[PDB]
Amino acid sequence: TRPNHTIYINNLNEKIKKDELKKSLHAIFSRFGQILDILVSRSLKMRGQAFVIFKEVSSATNALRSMQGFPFYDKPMRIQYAKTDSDIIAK
RNA sequence: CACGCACAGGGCAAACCAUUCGAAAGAGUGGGACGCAAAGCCUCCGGCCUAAACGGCAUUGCACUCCGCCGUAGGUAGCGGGGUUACCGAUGG
Numbered sequence: 518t519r520p521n522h523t524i525y526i527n528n529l530n531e532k533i534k535k536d537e538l539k540k541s542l543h544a545i546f547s548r549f550g551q552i553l554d555i556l557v558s559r560s561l562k563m564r565g566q567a568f569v570i571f572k573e574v575s576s577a578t579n580a581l582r583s584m585q586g587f588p589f590y591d592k593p594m595r596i597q598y599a600k601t602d603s604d605i606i607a608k
Numbered sequence: 609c610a611c612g613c614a615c616a617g618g619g620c621a622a623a624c625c626a627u628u629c630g631a632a633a634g635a636g637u638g639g640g641a642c643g644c645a646a647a648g649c650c651u652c653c654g655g656c657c658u659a660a661a662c663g664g665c666a667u668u669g670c671a672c673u674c675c676g677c678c679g680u681a682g683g684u685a686g687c688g689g690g691g692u693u694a695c696c697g698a699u700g701g
């Protein structure tokens with residue numbers, strides 16, 4: 518549970534189109550601070566989950582806690598501290 | 609109608625290379641020429657190739673490597689059956 522710049526989210530409505538998620542997560546996580554990116558693959562394993570990269574931890578954290586169990590596309594998303602740091606975060 | 613190395617006069621073009629289109633398969637154009645008696649034309653049937661989109665299922669996945677099954681949809685007529693039309697006329701029991 519080491520706080521991170523990026524957040525893991527799952528139980529995502531696998532029915533909503535990639536582009537749509539992208540636009541609609543920014544939609545509610547931008548409220549918590551600038552985002553450098555939101556990554557999402559539609560592949561068998563990476564589906565149902567998105568990765569949101571905030572500018573700084575401070576926002577991820579602020580983010581996380583507030584929207585846990587949050588009904589998104591009639592499907593309540595679990596949230597967590599990304600296990601690793603996205604690539605650009607090195608940079 | 610069918611048949612075939614009947615030498616008549618022709619057609620086409622595998623791999624490859626260049627380039628355009630497509631998610632892709634693959635397709636078109638250009639050089640190439642493996643090999644075609646229809647390797648002309650047509651996707652109705654079987655096979656195989658691709659999964660972008662569409663519908664169903666499966667999946668709770670910790671990624672920035674790969675991304676599943678069915679339907680379907682496309683492609684292949686140079687994978688095959690089939691249909692259709694065809695040049696030559698050594699050959700038709």
Ligand SMILES: Nc1nc2c(ncn2[C@@H]2O[C@@H]3COP(=O)(O)O[C@H]4[C@@H](O)[C@H](n5cnc6c(=O)[nH]c(N)nc65)O[C@@H]4COP(=O)(O)O[C@H]3[C@H]2O)c(=O)[nH]1
Nearest residue numbers: 612613614615616619620643644645646647648695696697
């Ligand atoms: N006019 C005519 N003659 C026929 C036919 N069938 C056989 N022949 C004669 O037989 C020769 C060899 O035929 P092949 O074994 O089928 O071997 C053939 C064939 O496989 C190929 N070919 C030529 N033209 C065509 C064509 O229009 N379509 C296809 N699929 N293959 C062809 O080239 C080979 C040699 O061809 P050729 O030099 O012409 O020499 C030919 C030709 O003189 C026919 O339907 N029409």
